[PDB]
């Protein structure tokens, strides 16, 4: 997956007008948008097609899929029907639940991103202790796309070690949560950035600024 | 705690509005509490909650297995309660801050959180099972009053009931299609969740009535 400027916009605004306006303002800097439940549950799954129509960006559906296999399959089918190119799936619920998503993605020509360790403080309680094993499970299952935490570069580096240089790794927690763009890109292929861009006085300038700070990494 | 008619919650995971409405309407005399998850919501929109309330007047549990960072969890809960859900199901494995974010919105909006502890499917044994007792204890410490645990593992369901105490409300999926027994599950759970055994039946109303007949002495 070739992500422009190694930068994925986390579009978590919850109003269609604002989400479209802000995304349009930064469109010259990105070609990949992560759309999650804040926007989808506020404006409907049709928002995905609207983004494709307006911006011709790739869309990652950040749905943190975390159900039993049968339900996971249904969620993935509905998500890909809406035009998402990829979906983010939790590894913590186990291998059968991940495989269910992999199967639908294969059937529909899409990608699964396996979320190993999360970026927020609560991730330390249960997820962190399982994360290396979740990553190995990904490798065993043939997963090629992963998410790990910008807020813990030593953990992000370990995840990169487990999955190898050929796998694709994206990383949230940059900016608002404390992660550094350049340090994160030592290990991740692409950074996810939400609030530092979409809550900025000038989102275009914010995106341009981040890209300037990593210009040697492009 | 919510008064679930017949101790039976319908997991409405059909993905078409017409079928979902038909089946729910057919079992309405037996069930006043419906769990609506992402299979239906992602297919038909959040307005499906509005339509269920309008048509059936059933309580709605939004089964969204909320599993994000605190800031995103808050947004998800706000959107879900805005649409009219009575309650939302939240994962505990992402930790206490993520759960607290959901509790804070539920408190502000006058709605409820259900904390998902252990899950019912085989994969739950890999990571969730080993964290589940602590997730439940965390819930108790945070003031969580509503929980979900697995019908498919009676020994685990019993332990989770012990941890949360008799006053907490416990619902349990995995009954029927996944192998759990209604009566045995109700030894520990306040209510059972049933999906496919009802909604894939030739006669969903007869399926629901049959389940209820089998647990009549527990009502
Ligand atoms: O570990 C993770 C995984 C995520 O998907 N995310 C998501 O990435 C985005 C981070 O946005 P922000 O840059 O505003 O912190 C949010 O959409 C959040 O749901 C995260 O923050 N941490
Ligand atoms: O541990 C759990 C938690 C759940 O919410 N569920 C949900 O409960 C329902 C089970 O439906 P069924 O009776 O068709 O197996 C599904 O909606 C599933 O997503 C589960 O099966 N196991």
Swiss-Prot record, chain A:
Pathway in which this enzyme or protein is active: Pyrimidine metabolism; UMP biosynthesis via de novo pathway; UMP from orotate: step 2/2
Enzyme Commission (EC) number: 4.1.1.23
GO cellular component, one term: cytosol
Binding site for substrate: 12, 34, 62-71, 119, 172-182, 194-195
Keyword set includes Lyase: yes
Pfam families, A to Z: OMPdecase (PF00215)
Any one GO molecular-function label of the UniProt entry: orotidine-5'-phosphate decarboxylase activity
Alphabetized UniProt keyword annotations: Decarboxylase, Lyase, Pyrimidine biosynthesis
Enzyme class of the recorded protein, top EC level: lyase
Active site positions, chain numbering: 64 (proton donor)
Biological processes annotated in GO: 'de novo' pyrimidine nucleobase biosynthetic process; 'de novo' UMP biosynthetic process
Catalytic reactions of this protein: orotidine 5'-phosphate + H(+) = UMP + CO2
Its biological purpose: Catalyzes the decarboxylation of orotidine 5'-monophosphate (OMP) to uridine 5'-monophosphate (UMP).
Record's subunit section: Homodimer.
Family membership: Belongs to the OMP decarboxylase family. Type 1 subfamily.
Name listed for the protein in its UniProt record: Orotidine 5'-phosphate decarboxylase
UniProt source species: Methanothermobacter thermautotrophicus (strain ATCC 29096 / DSM 1053 / JCM 10044 / NBRC 100330 / Delta H) (Methanobacterium thermoautotrophicum)
Gene field: pyrF
UniProtKB/Swiss-Prot annotation, chain B:
Any one GO MF annotation of this record: orotidine-5'-phosphate decarboxylase activity
GO terms under biological process: 'de novo' pyrimidine nucleobase biosynthetic process; 'de novo' UMP biosynthetic process
Active site: 65
Entry keywords, A to Z: Decarboxylase, Lyase, Pyrimidine biosynthesis
EC nos: 4.1.1.23
Catalytic activity: orotidine 5'-phosphate + H(+) = UMP + CO2
Cellular component terms (Gene Ontology): cytosol
Stored InterPro entries: Aldolase_TIM (IPR013785), OMPdecase (IPR014732), OMPdecase_arc (IPR047595), OMPdecase_AS (IPR018089), OMPdeCOase_dom (IPR001754), RibuloseP-bd_barrel (IPR011060)
Quaternary context: Homodimer.
Protein name: Orotidine 5'-phosphate decarboxylase
Organism: Methanothermobacter thermautotrophicus (strain ATCC 29096 / DSM 1053 / JCM 10044 / NBRC 100330 / Delta H)
């Amino acid at each position: 997956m070739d992500v422009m400027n190694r930068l994925i916009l986390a579009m978590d605004l919850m109003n269609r007008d604002d989400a479209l306006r802000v995304t349009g303002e930064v469109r010259e800097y990105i070609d990949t948008v992560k759309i999650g439940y804040p926007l989808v549950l506020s404006e409907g799954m049709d928002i995905i097609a609207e983004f494709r129509k307006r911006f011709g960006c790739r869309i990652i559906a950040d749905f943190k899929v975390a159900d039993i296999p049968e339900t996971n399959e249904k969620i993935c089918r509905a998500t890909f029907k809406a035009g998402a190119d990829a979906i983010i799936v939790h590894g913590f619920p186990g291998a059968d639940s991940v495989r269910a998503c992999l199967n639908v993605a294969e059937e529909m020509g899409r990608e699964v991103f396996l979320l190993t360790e999360m970026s927020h403080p609560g991730a330390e309680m249960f997820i962190q202790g399982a994360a290396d094993e979740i990553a190995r499970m990904g490798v065993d299952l043939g997963v090629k796309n992963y998410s790990g935490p910008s807020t813990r570069p030593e953990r992000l580096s370990r995840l990169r070690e487990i999955i190898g240089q050929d796998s694709f790794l994206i990383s949230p927690g940059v900016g608002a949560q404390g992660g550094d763009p350049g340090e994160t890109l030592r290990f991740a292929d692409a950074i996810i950035v939400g609030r530092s861009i979409y809550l900025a006085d000038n989102p275009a300038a914010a995106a341009a600024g981040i890209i300037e700070s990593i210009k040697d990494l492009l």
